[PDB]
Structures are given as structure tokens and as C-alpha cells.
Ligand SMILES: [Mg+2]
């Protein structure tokens with residue numbers, strides 16, 4: 001176990017983190033997956049760690065390997081105070097892979113998270129690079145309300161994933177009349 005900023009952030013040890021920051025450790029140094037201590041602090045919701053990292057010039061819009069950003073790490077775990085502080089420092093949701101974020105929210109049946117992406121200016125109709133969209137996923141999960149919202153947000157019903165399926169195509173195969181009925185209008 002190396003003694004680095006991630007070590008402290010993972011353990012929510014803001015005193016240790018502070019001491020390491022004063023010793024000159026670089027908060028913009030990331031692990032093998034592009035994870036920074038600010039990713040981790042934002043995920044754990046440790047406000048003191050977040051503030052100290054930002055003070056020592058952690059990039060508020062840092063992207064890891066999955067395209068995740070500190071703002072999203074905080075949003076997924078419901079750390080509203082950290083979200084506010086990150087926004088104040090210039091974090092934007094569209095700095096990350098919003099398509100991926102959107103699909104993840106759909107996969108977790110989390111409609112409030114989908115709306116928060118939109119609140120912060122994210123286009124939740126964007127697909128993953130694989131072509132899957134939150135609408136695709138919403139159909140599979142047969143999440144009626146989430147399908148509405150996504151449709152109301154302008155979600156492409158004829159968007160083909162990499163396996164040729166559109167959200168509409170999927171609706172017919174699951175025989176969810178309620179959902180197919182919504183595709184007609
Ligand atoms: Mg503490």
C-alpha cells in the first residue's frame with residue numbers, strides 16, 4: 001500500500017490528506033484507471049477532503065477511464081453538499097461521458113438522477129459509444145415513468161445500438177403494451 005493521496009481519501013482521513021498535501025503530493029496524479037483523490041473524496045462525500053483538494057488545485061473536471069467526473073461521483077451517492085461545492089468551482093456534468101451516466105441511472109432505476117443530469121445541463125438522450133441509450137435500458141427495465149421522461153426529453157426511438165436494436169424494437173419483444181402504446185404517440 002503506497003502512502004498517497006488516494007490512500008487518505010479512500011479512508012476519509014482529511015487530517016492525513018492535509019498533511020500529505022502540505023508535503024507536496026500532487027492531487028492531479030491518478031491511479032492506473034485515471035482515478036484521482038478528488039474522484040474518491042467526491043464519491044465518499046467527504047467535504048473537508050474535497051475542499052482541501054480543490055485548494056491544492058485538484059482539477060474539478062478530471063475524467064477517469066470510464067469517463068466519470070467528480071461531480072457525477074457525488075451525484076450518484078447523493079452527496080448534495082459536495083455537488084454544490086463542485087459546481088461552485090466550475091465542475092460541469094458535460095465534462096464527463098453523459099451518455100454513460102444516463103445509461104447507468106437507467107440501469108439503477110434512478111429517475112431522480114436522470115433529472116439531475118438534466119438539471120445540470122446534461123443531454124440524457126446521448127448514447128454510450130456502444131449505441132445503447134438510457135431509453136433502450138428503460139424499455140428493458142420496463143420502467144414506465146422513466147420511458148415517459150426520456151421520451152419527453154426527446155429520446156431517439158429509432159436509435160440502433162451496436163446490435164441493431166432500437167428502443168421501439170425492444171418494446172415489442174417484451175410485450176409491455178403500456179410501453180408500446182407510448183411509442184405510438
Ligand atoms: Mg474527517
Ligand SMILES: [Mg+2]
Pocket residue numbers: 055056057
Ligand atoms: Mg496553491
